[PDB]
Structure formats: C-alpha cells, structure tokens
Amino acid sequence: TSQLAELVDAAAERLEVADPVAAFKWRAQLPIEDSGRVEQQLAKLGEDARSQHIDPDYVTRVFDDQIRATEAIEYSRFSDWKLNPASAPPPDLSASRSAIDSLNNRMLSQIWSHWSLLSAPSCAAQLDRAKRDIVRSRHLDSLYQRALTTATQSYCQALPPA
Amino acid sequence: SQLAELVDAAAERLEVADPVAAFKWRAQLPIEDSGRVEQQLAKLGEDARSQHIDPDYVTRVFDDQIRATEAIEYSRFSDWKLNPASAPPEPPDLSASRSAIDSLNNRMLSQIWSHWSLLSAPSCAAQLDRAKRDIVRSRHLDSLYQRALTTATQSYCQALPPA
Numbered sequence: 548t549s550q551l552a553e554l555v556d557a558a559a560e561r562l563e564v565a566d567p568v569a570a571f572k573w574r575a576q577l578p579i580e581d582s583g584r585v586e587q588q589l590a591k592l593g594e595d596a597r598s599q600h601i602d603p604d605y606v607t608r609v610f611d612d613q614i615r616a617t618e619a620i621e622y623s624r625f626s627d628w629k630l631n632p633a634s635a636p637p638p639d640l641s642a643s644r645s646a647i648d649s650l651n652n653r654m655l656s657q658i659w660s661h662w663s664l665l666s667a668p669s670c671a672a673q674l675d676r677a678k679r680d681i682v683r684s685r686h687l688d689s690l691y692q693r694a695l696t697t698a699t700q701s702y703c704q705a706l707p708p709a
Numbered sequence: 710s711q712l713a714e715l716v717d718a719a720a721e722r723l724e725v726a727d728p729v730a731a732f733k734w735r736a737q738l739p740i741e742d743s744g745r746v747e748q749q750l751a752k753l754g755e756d757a758r759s760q761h762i763d764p765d766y767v768t769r770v771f772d773d774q775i776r777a778t779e780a781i782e783y784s785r786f787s788d789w790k791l792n793p794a795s796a797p798p799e800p801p802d803l804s805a806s807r808s809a810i811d812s813l814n815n816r817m818l819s820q821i822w823s824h825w826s827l828l829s830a831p832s833c834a835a836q837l838d839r840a841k842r843d844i845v846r847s848r849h850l851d852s853l854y855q856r857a858l859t860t861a862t863q864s865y866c867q868a869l870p871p872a
C-alpha cells in the first residue's frame with residue numbers, strides 16, 4: 548500500500564463531488580467556473596495550511612490542480628448533457644460542501660504526515676502506485692483517471708538538481 | 710448520398726467550435742451566448758419564411774446544431790482544464806469565427822431547400838445515415854464529433870412533404 552494512498556483516495560473522493568455539483572448547476576443554469584470563488588477557496592486553504600504549519604504555496608498549487616480537475620469533470624458532464632439533456636441526473640449543495648470540507652482536512656493531514664516523501668525521489672513511484680490502486684478500488688473511468696492525474700501533478704516536489 | 714453536402718456543411722460548422730472555444734478560453738468568456746443564438750435563429754427563421762421554407766423545421770434543426778456546438782466547446786474546456794498547455798494560444802477572433810458560421814448557416818439552409826423532397830421522404834433516414842458515414846470518414850471525425858453530428862442532424866428527417 549502506497550504511503551500516498553490515503554491522500555490520493557481523498558483526492559479522488561473529492562473529484563467525485565463534481566457530479567452532484569454539475570447536476571445542480573445544470574438544473575439551476577449556473578456556470579461551472581467562477582474565478583472569484585476559486586480565489587476565495589484557495590485563500591482559505593492557504594490559511595488552513597498556515598495554521599497547520601504546512602507550506603501554503605504548495606497547498607495552493609495542489610488545490611488549484613484539484614479544483615481545475617474537478618471543473619474538468621463538470622464541463623465534461625455539461626457536454627454530455629447538451630448532447631442528451633434527458634440524461635442530466637438534485638439536491639442542494641450542502642452535502643457536497645460538508646464533504647469537501649472533510650476531504651480538504653483529510654488531504655491537508657496527509658500533506659503534513661507525508662511531507663518528507665512528497666519532497667523525496669521516491670515520491671513519483673509512490674504516487675504512481677497510489678493512483679493505480681485508487682483507480683482500481685474506486686473503479687475510476689477514463690475521465691476520472693485523467694482528472695486524478697491533473698489533480699495530483701504537483702504532489703511530488705522538485706529535487707535538488709545536483 | 711444526396712444529403713452529403715448538407716451533412717458536410719453541418720460537420721464543417723461543428724469544427725468552428727474549436728477556434729470559438731479557444732478564443733473564449735483565452736478571454737474567459739462563457740460558452741453559451743443566448744443573444745447570438747437568438748440573433749441567428751431570428752435571421753434564419755426570416756430567411757426560411759422569405760424563401761417559403763417551413764420555419765419551425767429550420768429553427769429545430771439549427772437549435773440542434775447550436776446545442777451540439779456548445780457541447781463540443783464544453784468538452785474542449787474540460788480537456789483544457791485537465792491540460793491548459795493544449796489550448797490554442799492564438800485562435801482567430803470570435804468575429805471571424807461568427808462570420809464563417811454565418812456563411813455555413815446560409816449553405817445549410819440552401820441545402821435544406823434544395824433537398825426538401827428527400828428530407829421529407831421515407832428514404833431520408835437511410836440517406837442521412839449514409840451521408841453521416843461518409844462525412845465522418847472524409848473529415849476523420851472523432852468520437853466527440855460523431856456524437857455531435859448525430860445530435861446536429863437528429864431532426865433532419867422531420868421535414869413535411871409539400872401540400
């Protein structure tokens with residue numbers, strides 16, 4: 548089991564919030580993106596990182612990836628639903644909000660716990676193993692696999708060049 | 710197929726979704742532009758009436774085409790959210806893309822008029838499936854564009870024969 552399995556699993560579960568959120572936005576005729584909103588969300592995550600003695604710039608980069616990957620899923624659904632509106636699957640977003648708050652906390656806990664590994668040469672391999680295992684355990688489809696890659700692309704920190 | 714030119718025009722117009730998406734991505738503009746949709750449907754409705762073509766049929770067809778186009782734009786935004794480096798950095802202006810669309814709109818309505826007797830005939834469904842096969846091949850349409858072309862053309866065979 549990869550040391551990054553809990554982090555990646557949390558990231559994947561958080562991606563899955565894309566579906567109820569997109570279903571809601573579709574019915575409510577709301578757009579997917581909102582730059583001001585995301586700026587606020589990222590700022591709050593940075594504050595969370597500071598209070599937890601985690602590098603806020605790192606957390607900001609990682610969650611920027613996470614949020615873009617999530618928006619990618621939402622846009623893919625909107626595409627599908629434009630072609631086939633009868634397929635659009637609702638309710639309000641309070642459940643999703645609570646889930647994201649809990650998953651944010653889980654993710655930050657693992658960034659803290661596994662900071663040495665995230666800084667290490669073994670990060671890339673351990674991330675690849677974690678992804679493999681979560682793709683399988685969560686039965687992630689091609690869209691979610693691409694999203695998980697995007698979401699996690701900044702986990703592993705650059706190494707000294709000499 | 711006698712519907713190949715119409716389907717080709719439809720597919721060509723679908724392909725304008727790419728530069729349109731690219732422009733909107735760079736400019737951070739919404740994908741849906743209800744004003745522009747209304748403008749087109751109004752003009753086309755009037756052209757149909759003036760040429761004595763059933764405007765309700767024409768509106769339906771273009772609604773389908775427009776929805777399919779929006780679907781492609783959403784899909785590209787999805788792709789670019791996953792990998793922003795794949796977004797075309799210097800797309801043509803939206804104005805230019807809209808002019809190209811205006812011309813394709815006209816070509817499609819001209820083809821609808823020309824092939825009214827086939828669009829309203831029982832052989833329409835067969836001829837449409839044939840045209841789609843051939844244009845999918847000739848344009849090398851991928852999975853997304855195949856879906857989009859089905860959506861764009863789904864009302865073609867609804868045309869009523871003249872009284």
Ligand SMILES: O=C(O)[C@@H]1C[C@]2(C(=O)O)C=C[C@@H](O)[C@@H](C2)O1
Nearest residue numbers: 729740741742745746775778779
């Ligand atoms: O902005 C646009 O011009 C493009 C083209 C489009 C159409 O299909 O005509 C018209 C309006 C928009 O909602 C979509 C679809 O994007």
